[model samples]
Target chain A: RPKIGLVLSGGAARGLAHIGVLKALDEQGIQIDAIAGTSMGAVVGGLYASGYTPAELERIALEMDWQPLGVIQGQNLAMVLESLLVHTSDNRDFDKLAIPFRAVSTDIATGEKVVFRKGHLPQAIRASMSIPAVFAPVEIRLLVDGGMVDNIPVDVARDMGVDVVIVVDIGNPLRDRKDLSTVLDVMNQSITLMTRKNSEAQLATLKPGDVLIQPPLSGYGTTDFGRVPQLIDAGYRATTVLAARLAEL
Target chain B: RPKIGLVLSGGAARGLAHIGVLKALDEQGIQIDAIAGTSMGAVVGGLYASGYTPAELERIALEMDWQLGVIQGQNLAMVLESLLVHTSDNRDFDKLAIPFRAVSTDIATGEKVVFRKGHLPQAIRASMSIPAVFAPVEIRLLVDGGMVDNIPVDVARDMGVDVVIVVDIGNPLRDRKDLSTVLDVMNQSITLMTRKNSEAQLATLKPGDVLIQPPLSGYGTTDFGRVPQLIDAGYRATTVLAARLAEL
Candidate 1:
C-alpha cells in the first residue's frame, strides 16, 4: 500500500490543467491521501480538499471571465474559489476534508512561508496566486505569490509521512508568443518570463520519490486564453501518461 | 535474473513514442532480452537490437525529411544508415546481447514474415511498409510480412522468454468516417494499424502477459507536438512496468 499525495504549482491559468489531472487520477481509481499547493496550486488543492469534484472545478475555470479575477485591469482575483468557501463542510477552517490539507502562502511583509489551517482558505489562495503584474496582489498580511513561501509543498507532504507525492507543475517555461497584442505581450514577458529560471531551479531540486508531472505548454501568464480546451486536453494527456503508474499505486 | 521482452506494434509515426519509452526504460535501468515487432515495430526494435542509442535514434528521427523519394514516407532506413553506423559491434542478432527481429507479409503470396538474422535493414523495411497505404518496397520477394499480420507475438515465443509485454496502439473499432487519401495521412496509417490481421495475434496471451493500449491522451501533430505526450506515454508506461517488476 502507498500513501500518495498531490502537489500543485502556481502557473496562472495553466493551473486549470490540474482539473484534468484530478479527473484522470479519479478514473484510474487512485486516491489522494493529502494535498498541497502554492498560489494557483493553493486554489486547486484547497477546493479539491473541500470536496469540489473535478467536473465542477473544471466548470468554474472555463466560466471565469477574468474581469472578475482582475486580468484586464489587474485585480486580486476571486468569486468561484472564495464563494465555494461559504459552503465548505468544515464550516470555515476548511478542515472538513476527511484527509489532511495544507495551504502554503508567503508573508508579504517578512517574505516567509505561511500555512493556513481552517482560516480564510480563499484569502490564502488569493495571496498565493497573486501574479505581480497581471493580477493585483492580495494583502492579507503580505503581497506576493506562493513561490516566495513554498512554490510546491513537497516537504510539507513528506512531513505528513506520505510515501509518494505527485507534483503537478504548471509554472513551466512556455514558448513566448510575440504575436499577442502589446499589452498582453508585456504582461506575459514581465510576469511569466521573470520566473522561468526560478521554476527550473525548483524543478531541479526535487528529491527521491517525487513524481513530478509538468505540461508542455510554453507561454507565460494566462496564455492564448482561447486555448482552454487544449489545456484540458493536455491535462487528460497526462492521464494517458499516469495510467501506467496509478494502477500500481 | 528476470528476462523481459519488448514488443513494438505497427503504428508508423506513433512508433516515435518508442524513443521516449526507451529513454524512460534506461532511466529506470530496465533490461530486455528479446524484442519483436511488425512493420514500423520491426524498424524500431531492430535498431535497438543493433545497439542504436536512444539519443542517436531520436536525432535520426527529428532530422529526416519524409519528402525524400528514396525514403517513401516514414522511412526508417534513411535515418538508420546515418544513425546506426556509430556503433562498433556487428549490427544484427549474432552480436546483440539483446536479440531482435521484425515481421512482414509477402506482397504476392500474403504470408507472415519474420526477419531475425539475414538482410537486416531491407527485411525490416519490407516488414514495416503497410501495403495499399505506404507503397511497398519490393525486396527479396523472399520478403514482406505485415499485410494481414500487424502484431507478431510468437516471435518472442520462439526466443524462449520468461515475460512478454505487448504495447498495442492498434484498436480500430471506434466509429469514424471512411475516406480516400488514407495512405497520405498519419491518422489513416494508425487507423489501418488498428484493424490489421497481425494485431489479432495478441489474443493468445498466457497468464502474466502485459498489454498497454494508447491511453486517450497520446500527444499529436494536431495537439501539443511530440515532447509532452511522448514523455507522458513513455514515463507512465515505465512507472506501471516498474510497479509490476517490483511485484516479482
Candidate 2:
C-alpha cells in the first residue's frame, strides 16, 4: 500500500472533478492515504475523508438544486455541506481521523498559514476555500483562500512524508478561468492567480517520483455546476490514464 | 421654500452622484420638499430622508467598512435567512424635513409597487432593485422600481412641490476613457433593461418641469484602485453643476 495524498483545488463546482479522481483510485482498490485540500478541495475532501466514497459524493452533487435562491443571497459550498458535516469547535486532533487531513486557511490580517488539525471542520473548509469574491472571506482567527499560499498544499503533504504524492489539479487546466467578465469570473481569476502561483512554485520542486494529474474540464463555473454527467464522464476518462500510469509504477 | 423634488436613479454605486447632486442642492440652500427615488435612489434618499445630511452620508461612505460580516458568512447555516432580512418597521418619514416615497417591484407578481407604506429602510430597499447586483427583494409582486417607473416625478409632484425638477442620470456617456464610463455603460445596460423607454417617459413631462441630466464621473470614492478617480469625477461634475441647477 503506497501512502498517497490528494490536493483538491478551490474551483467552486470544479471540486466535483476530485470525485472522479478518487473514484478512479477506488476502482483499482487504490486508497488515498492522506489528503490536503483548499476550498472546494476541502469541501469535497472533508466529506470523502469522513467516509463517503467519491461515487456517493457524486450522487449527492448530481441531485443538488443549484438555484434554489442565489440572486438575493450569497451561495457558499459550506451551506450545501451542512447535511454532510456540522462544524465542531472542541479541540479535535487531525491525526485521529480515519485518513490524515490538513485543510488550510491564510490569515490576511496576521499573514499566517493556519492549518486545521481539528476544531471546526466546516469552518476550516469554509476558510480554506474562501475565494475572495465568490464566497466572502472566512474572517477571524482571520481566514482567506488556502490556495493564496498553498493551492494544492503539496508542500503540506510532503511534510507528512508521503513516499509518492499524486496531486490531482482541476484548476488551471480548465478554460473557465480565462473569462474575466462576470462577478464569478473575477472570483475565478483571483483564486486562479493564487493557486497558479503555488502550482508553479511546487512544480519546480517536483522530482522524478511525484505524480501530477490535470483533467480537462469545460464550461463556465455556474453552468458547470449543472454539467454533472459531463464533468463525471470527463473526470473518469481523464484520470483513467493517470491511474493507469500509477499502476505501471 | 423652494418646494423641490429630487429623483434618485438606480445606477448602483454610481448613484453616489445623488449625494453630489443633493450636496450641490445643499450648498445653494435649495430645500428638497418632497423626494422620490428608486434602487440606489431609495438607499440614498431613504438615508437622507431619515435626517442623515448629505455631508454626514458622504462621511459615512468615506468611513464605511465594506467587510462587515459579509466575507466570513460562509459557515452560516439557514443561509436563506441571511440572504434576505425581514423588513424593518422602524424610522417613519412623517416627521422628516423632507417626506419621501420610493418605488420597487414585487418579484412574486410582476407588478410595480409604490412604497408608500412600511419601514423606511425596507421601503428604500424595495425601491432600490438593480437586478443581479442586489438580490430581488421580497415584497409580493415587486420588480425593479426602475421597471414600471424609472423616474417617479409624479410621486413627488403628488406631494405638491412648487417646481418639479427631474434629475436624470439614465443616459449613457460616450467617448470618455475612465472607470466611471465603464460603470456608466454597466448602469445603462442594467437600468436600460429594467427601466422602460426614457424618451417615452420624458415625453410625458409637462412644460416648465425642469430637467437636469448630469454626466456620471465617479461610481465610488474609496481610496483604492478605480475609486479615487471616480470620486474625483463625481465631485467635478457636481461642482460645475451649481450654476446650471440654479438657472433652473
**lDDT for each residue of candidate 1 in B12-106, tens digit (9 for 90 to 100):** 65666666667667666778788888766677677887777767667766665544323463455555555556443454564565688777754
Candidate lDDT (C-alpha), each: 0.62, 0.61
Task: Choose the strongest candidate by TM-score.
Answer: 2
True contacts kept of each: 0.00, 0.00
TM-score of each: 0.44, 0.47
lDDT of 2 by residue, A34-117 (tens): 888877778778888767778888888888786623211224566655557643334266656667788987664444578887
Chain B TM-score for each model? 0.77, 0.72
Q: List candidate 2 segments past 4 Å from native.
A: A68-79, A86-91, A173-179, A182-191, A218-223, B1-248
Interface DockQ per candidate: 0.01, 0.01
Backbone collisions counted per model: 18, 14
Q: What TM-score would chain B of candidate 2 score versus the native chain B?
A: 0.72
- Cα error, residue A239 of model 1, in Å, equals 2.5
